[PDB]
Design a protein around this nucleic acid. Structure first.
Ligand code: MG
Ligand code: MG
Ligand code: MG
Ligand code: MG
Ligand code: MG
Ligand code: MG
Ligand code: MG
Ligand code: MG
Ligand code: MG
Lengths: 109, 199, 176, 138, 190
RNA sequence: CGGAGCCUCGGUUGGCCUCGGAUAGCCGGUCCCCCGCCGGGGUCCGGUGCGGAGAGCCCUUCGUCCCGGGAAACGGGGCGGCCGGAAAGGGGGCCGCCCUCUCGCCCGUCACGCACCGCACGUUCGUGGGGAACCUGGCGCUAAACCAUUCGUAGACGACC
RNA sequence: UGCGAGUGCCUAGUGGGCCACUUUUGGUAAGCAGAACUGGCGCUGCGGGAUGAACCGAACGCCGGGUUAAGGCGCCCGAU
């Protein structure tokens, strides 16, 4: 009846100063701001949910406008709770600073 | 979802540093009352700096050259613009989702204004160091609305004081209320206390 | 030498190799403050080469061991005689410090000299360090702590941890 | 005006670091920003601590500036600091925060269901008081 | 080096009283009352002794340049007390060689008209800072007398008129005309 | 002002409705006291690593069905009037209304529901913005601008009077 | 200590060089002219020095994961 995922922001790609690696995304999960605090989310899978023009099939429902790219948190990134993620398709650059769902169910509690 | 910041007592660049990254990350930031932003260093230094910036001008056609905005809100906005990548469309979107005001307009005078201690003068400056006020600097470099903003701000202050006194009377009534009805609510105060919600 | 981290006190002993001229040369010991025993032995060879007619190849280290302080829980005043190379000429200097350990006092001296004269641990040449009785100290910055009923408040407590509640709604308090 | 001073014998709460959340007693002052400290009755060895990791409390127990852990301890138990600290409101809200962080799913459900009715009763009787103010104004 | 403590006290005479509102000092005595704010100097002000005998200013952990400011506060408070219990009187002499300097006082002692200075014809106005009264002396040939409660305002106004009567583009070593502060004292000479 | 749908653009997945400020000091009451149009000051009482705490507060939604306790009764919900706003104007409070419920909230009793057979974009803001039409109704409205012509306070041509 | 060596034919291009640490001649000096040793650029991309032939690191088949060099970690811009 309510939300079941954590909110994250797609901050950018894994990059040096002048080189971009599009196969690894950077997520900023809201609330966590520490390396020792970001351990809980390792291995959790994440979704990028967007809407397009024409209908697509929907598992367990009728076709609608929504589509998803599925990925997974790989490991932490820096001292400020930034995490790295790998999506099965590299994220489009129009998703910078947009909401990414981090699910709970790949759980190890 | 809208982050409303108060500008009084902050340091210009050190606050713009926070705001720029926050806006790049998609938040809608509204910085309010920018005439109270402070800058480290004494006033004569700061106005010489701004006058050198004023002298910066395109020799062939000044109307094409750098634009020297005089309002304090516009000075802060241009600082954030310099910290953002404004030549790209992502930076332009960030600029669009940032908004800055002088004084406190009616859209936001009825909202709780936050504060950023990381960019706060009392925290980041030794007490013996001198500083300056952005409102005074803007007025002395050309701003034409220091007095009107002052009168509107004081009006807002009496209205806010009326509201605050009403709030205080209401909450004193509430505390009188709870110490009136503690006997009937005693079965819940203990279950709050045992989990640390009270006291 | 690089004054990495907290220094340590090392007793280093050494002597020339036995030659047909003399069956056994005299032993020489020295107090050396260094991050570890490798640099301690390096500094021993440096100093003993400076003083006597000895070299790494013609001598040998006999015992290199850390020296622990005999009272690490009582505060002491240390007087330090040293020698450093400025941009123009070299100078002898006497300094006062106040802490628990001799190695701590020496590393504090290194930090102080770097901060105040821009001298560097390779230019600084420590020669003497002695624990000084409280009545023989000469510098006011350490003598003013020789008050049995010492008393002072903490006037202006600057806020730290200013990024954990990054966007707070309270103006921080500085008086406690 | 200041009320809390750093002299020999004052006890102080340790906010961050290894020995965080424990009381200590100032034994001596080394320099401008470091003190020789020892908490004998609270599992803290005698050592040096910066003043910026300590925050003073309004308790003073009296002993000489170079006394041993034996005498610091005897002062501690005869001044029974361990009970006065728990009686103070400072430690009460410390343990309140600790309990609130300790809550689980079920007991936070209980808290929600309890404060729901508590707030209902308070709000109703406040409305009653407001209309009482209106009627006596009339 | 940082000095642990630097303190200094000032005694308070009995007829006058002092009240402290933070770092603002309010002093009330027979001649009136006056207030000074010290929120720019960052010290500790205590008002100790029952029947309010001593004011103690002290600073903790200060270096040279602002442990030098401790005695400045004591001197200001002493000048303040002296003003409120005795008042300040600045006696100024008008000196000239050939042209008599004409001084006329108006607005009840708050404005000074200077005429015929060095034989000029431009009439020089000076307006006296509030709470300071200028009077023409008696039993003296060319003297102004300045009456006030605050040494700051009295001396500032005296300097105003002194540097208003100034000689330009000539040898001031020989053109020794103008009005200069001859003596600085009190109203009630106790 | 008063219905079903269609196409297109997307983002989002509970709200915080506000003192002013100081920082070598603050906050909250009280008024015994003093002034002013309830406000300011004085005394006193309490908090201050802030608990009248943004480390915070509010709302918290599986639904229905019987009966009991607690809480409510002055309450819930739905029509006429009074005020509340200008810096970029308040879907708020109050007074009556014809009506209806002992239902809403907390503990219990009672059973019931597509129990879709381990599996993903689920759960909103949202009658969202925009564009076309099908529409049943009511209240109303039947304008200008430009060209052509004329003018010369204007003018290369446009423009302008 | 390390390593498989010896040997014969035919042979293209080249025969304008330039730079840097230490040595060094002329010259007041030069992004000047002339030498010695070693390494580079020319013939060479890549990380850092904002920008750059020769500077610091490191030399290159097409890729996934991990870790580093020099240089860095307020925002632009990855990292206190
Ligand atoms: Mg002349
Ligand atoms: Mg949706
Ligand atoms: Mg050459
Ligand atoms: Mg070539
Ligand atoms: Mg080659
Ligand atoms: Mg190369
Ligand atoms: Mg450069
Ligand atoms: Mg790789
Ligand atoms: Mg950089």
């Amino acid at each position: 009846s309510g939300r079941l995922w954590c909110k994250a922001i797609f901050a950018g790609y894994k990059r040096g100063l002048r080189n971009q690696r599009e196969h690894t995304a950077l997520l900023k999960i809201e609330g966590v701001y520490a390396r020792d605090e970001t351990e809980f989310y390792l291995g959790k899978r994440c979704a990028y949910v967007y809407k397009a023009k024409n209908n697509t099939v929907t598992p367990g429902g009728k076709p609608n406008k929504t589509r998803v790219i599925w990925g997974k948190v790989t490991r932490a990134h820096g001292n400020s709770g930034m995490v790295r993620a790998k999506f099965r398709s590299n994220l489009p650059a129009k998703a910078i600073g947009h909401r990414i769902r981090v699910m709970l169910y790949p759980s190890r509690i | 979802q809208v982050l409303v910041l108060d500008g009084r007592g902050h340091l210009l660049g050190r606050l713009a540093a926070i705001v720029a990254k926050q806006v790049l990350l998609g938040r809608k930031v509204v910085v309010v009352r920018c005439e109270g932003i402070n800058i480290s260093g004494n006033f004569y230094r700061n106005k010489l700096k701004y006058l050198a910036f004023l002298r910066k001008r395109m020799n062939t056609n000044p109307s094409r050259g750098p634009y020297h905005f005089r309002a304090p809100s516009r000075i802060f906005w241009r600082t954030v613009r310099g910290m953002l990548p404004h030549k790209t469309k992502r930076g332009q979107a960030a600029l669009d989702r940032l908004k800055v005001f002088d004084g406190i307009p009616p859209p936001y005078d009825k909202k709780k204004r936050m504060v950023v201690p990381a960019a706060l003068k009392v925290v980041r400056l030794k007490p013996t160091r001198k500083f300056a006020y952005l409102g005074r600097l803007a007025h002395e470099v050309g701003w034409k609305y220091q007095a009107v903003t002052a009168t509107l701000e004081e009006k807002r202050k009496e209205k806010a004081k009326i509201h605050y006194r009403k709030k205080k009377q209401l909450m004193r009534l509430r505390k009188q209320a709870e110490k009136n009805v503690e006997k009937k609510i005693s079965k819940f105060t203990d279950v709050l206390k045992t989990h640390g919600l009270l006291v | 030498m690089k004054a990495s981290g907290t220094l340590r006190e090392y007793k280093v002993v050494g002597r020339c190799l036995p030659t047909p001229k003399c069956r056994t040369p005299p032993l020489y010991r020295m107090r050396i403050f260094a991050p570890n025993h490798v640099v301690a032995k390096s500094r021993f060879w440096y100093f003993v080469s400076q003083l006597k007619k000895m070299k790494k190849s013609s001598g040998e280290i006999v015992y290199c061991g850390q020296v622990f302080e005999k009272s690490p829980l009582r505060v002491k005043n240390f007087g330090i005689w040293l020698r450093y190379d400025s941009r123009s000429g070299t100078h002898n200097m006497y300094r006062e410090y106040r802490d628990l350990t001799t190695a701590g006092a020496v590393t504090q001296c290194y930090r102080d000299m770097g901060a105040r004269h821009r001298a560097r641990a390779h230019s600084i040449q420590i020669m003497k360090v002695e624990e000084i009785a409280a009545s023989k100290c000469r510098r006011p910055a350490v003598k003013q702590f020789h008050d049995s009923k010492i008393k002072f408040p903490l006037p202006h407590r600057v806020l730290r941890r200013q990024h954990k509640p990054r966007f707070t709604t309270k103006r921080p308090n500085t008086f406690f | 005006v200041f009320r809390r001073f750093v002299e020999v014998g004052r006890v102080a709460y340790v906010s961050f670091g290894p020995h965080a959340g424990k009381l200590v007693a100032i034994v001596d002052v080394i320099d401008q920003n470091r003190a020789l400290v020892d908490g004998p009755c609270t599992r803290v060895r005698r050592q040096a601590m910066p003043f910026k990791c300590m925050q003073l409390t309004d308790f003073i127990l009296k002993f000489p500036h170079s006394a041993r852990q034996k005498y610091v301890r005897k002062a501690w138990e005869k001044a029974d600091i361990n009970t006065k600290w728990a009686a103070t409101r400072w430690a009460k809200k410390i343990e309140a925060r600790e309990r609130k962080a300790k809550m689980t799913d079920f007991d936070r459900y209980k808290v929600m269901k309890a404060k729901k009715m508590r707030n209902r009763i308070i709000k109703n009787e406040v409305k009653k008081l407001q209309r009482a103010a209106l009627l006596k104004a009339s | 080096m940082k000095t642990i403590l630097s303190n200094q006290t000032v005694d308070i005479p009995e007829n006058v009283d002092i009240s402290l509102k933070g770092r603002t000092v309010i002093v009330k005595g027979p001649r009136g009352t006056l207030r000074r704010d010290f929120n720019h100097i960052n010290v500790e002000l205590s008002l100790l002794g029952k029947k309010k005998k001593r004011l103690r200013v002290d600073k903790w952990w200060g270096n040279r340049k602002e442990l030098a400011t401790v005695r400045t506060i004591c001197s200001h408070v002493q000048n303040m007390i002296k003003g409120v219990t005795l008042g300040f009187r600045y006696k100024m002499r008008s000196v000239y060689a050939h042209f008599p300097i004409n001084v006329v006082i108006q607005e009840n002692g708050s404005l000074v008209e200077i005429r015929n200075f060095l034989g000029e014809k431009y009439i020089r106005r000076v307006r006296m800072r509030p709470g300071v009264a200028c009077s023409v002396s008696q039993a003296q040939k060319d003297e102004l007398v300045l009456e006030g409660n605050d040494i700051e305002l009295v001396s500032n106004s005296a300097a105003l008129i002194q540097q208003a009567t100034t000689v330009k583009n000539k040898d001031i070593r020989k053109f020794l005309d103008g009005i200069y502060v001859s003596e600085k004292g009190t109203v009630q000479q106790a």
